Design an enzyme around this catalytic site. Structure first.
Site: not given
Length: 279
Positions: A39, A69, A161, A224
């Site tokens: 990530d 994130h 998404n 996520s």
């Protein structure tokens, strides 16, 4: 063990029904497992990680999470207050820049890195990789995820998404890894969540409270956010000896809450990650 006033997603994975606020889990808590969070990095100094997090690889000048994130996702895996597997070891691999973006070549390199690096690490209960990332279909990206899984790591990836079929996205579309969709606190498919036959499981993804950079916390939404719930659950179940890296996704589907979600399109599994913990 029982955590009162838990984030809703943690309560959700230890209940047959929505709306509760206590997370019930075996005290082993993923001790002896390891989860690579691939990530934007992890703020390892955040007190919520209790020293159980470290950066192991970056593909940019700095190893710091300048976005948040990756820190948020790592917190859902294994932070004290916000994590599924509160005792697991967290390894950060920074394949995404501080804007949250990364080239496919870098993401592939990061997966190959994890497959080798796990041999440098003490992970007696097994190894998991959580990939809260993706873009359009790429055979090369799918192959890299398949290699990581084949190498002996439980790979969990975000479905995406786009409110669309995940067959057009990678690594979501790779059949051999665990592709995770998102749900909300009322057991609806999250409005943004991808769907399709390639999905294996759903996890909590709307309004997920977790760690953030600067020693902070915040609530955000995404597949996520659902992915690290499933990664943490796998690490927890591997520590309990109930499954292995090769079979954890199928085991999680085997033992999921079935038929509880609304707005699931025809052809998509209706399965929500569940730990079946009995005190």
């Amino acid at each position: 063990a029982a955590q009162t006033n838990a984030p809703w997603g943690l309560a959700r994975i230890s209940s047959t029904s929505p709306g509760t606020s206590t997370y019930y889990y075996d005290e082993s808590a993923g001790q002896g497992s390891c989860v690579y969070v691939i990530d934007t990095g992890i703020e390892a100094s955040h007190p919520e990680f209790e020293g159980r997090a470290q950066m192991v690889k970056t593909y940019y000048y700095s190893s710091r999470d300048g976005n948040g994130h990756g820190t948020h996702c790592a917190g859902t895996v294994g932070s004290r207050t916000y994590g599924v597997a509160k005792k697991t070891q967290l390894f950060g691999v920074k394949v995404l820049d501080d804007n949250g973006s990364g080239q496919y070549s870098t993401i592939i390199a990061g997966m190959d890195f994890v497959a080798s690096d796990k041999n440098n690490r003490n992970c007696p209960k097994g190894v998991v990789a959580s990939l809260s990332l993706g873009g359009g279909y790429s055979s090369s990206v799918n192959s890299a995820a398949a290699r990581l899984q084949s190498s002996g790591v439980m790979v969990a990836v975000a479905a995406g998404n786009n409110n669309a079929d995940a067959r057009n996205y990678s690594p979501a579309s790779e059949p051999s890894v665990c592709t995770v969709g998102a749900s909300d606190r009322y057991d609806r498919r999250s409005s943004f969540s991808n769907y399709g036959s390639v999905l294996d499981i759903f996890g909590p993804g709307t309004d997920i409270l977790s760690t953030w950079i600067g020693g902070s916390t915040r609530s955000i939404s995404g597949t996520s956010m659902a992915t690290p719930h499933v990664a943490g659950l796998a690490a927890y179940l591997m520590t309990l000896g109930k499954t292995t890296a090769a079979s954890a996704c199928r085991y999680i589907a085997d033992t999921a809450n079935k038929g509880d979600l609304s707005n699931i399109p025809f052809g998509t599994v209706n399965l929500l990650a569940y730990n079946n913990y009995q005190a």
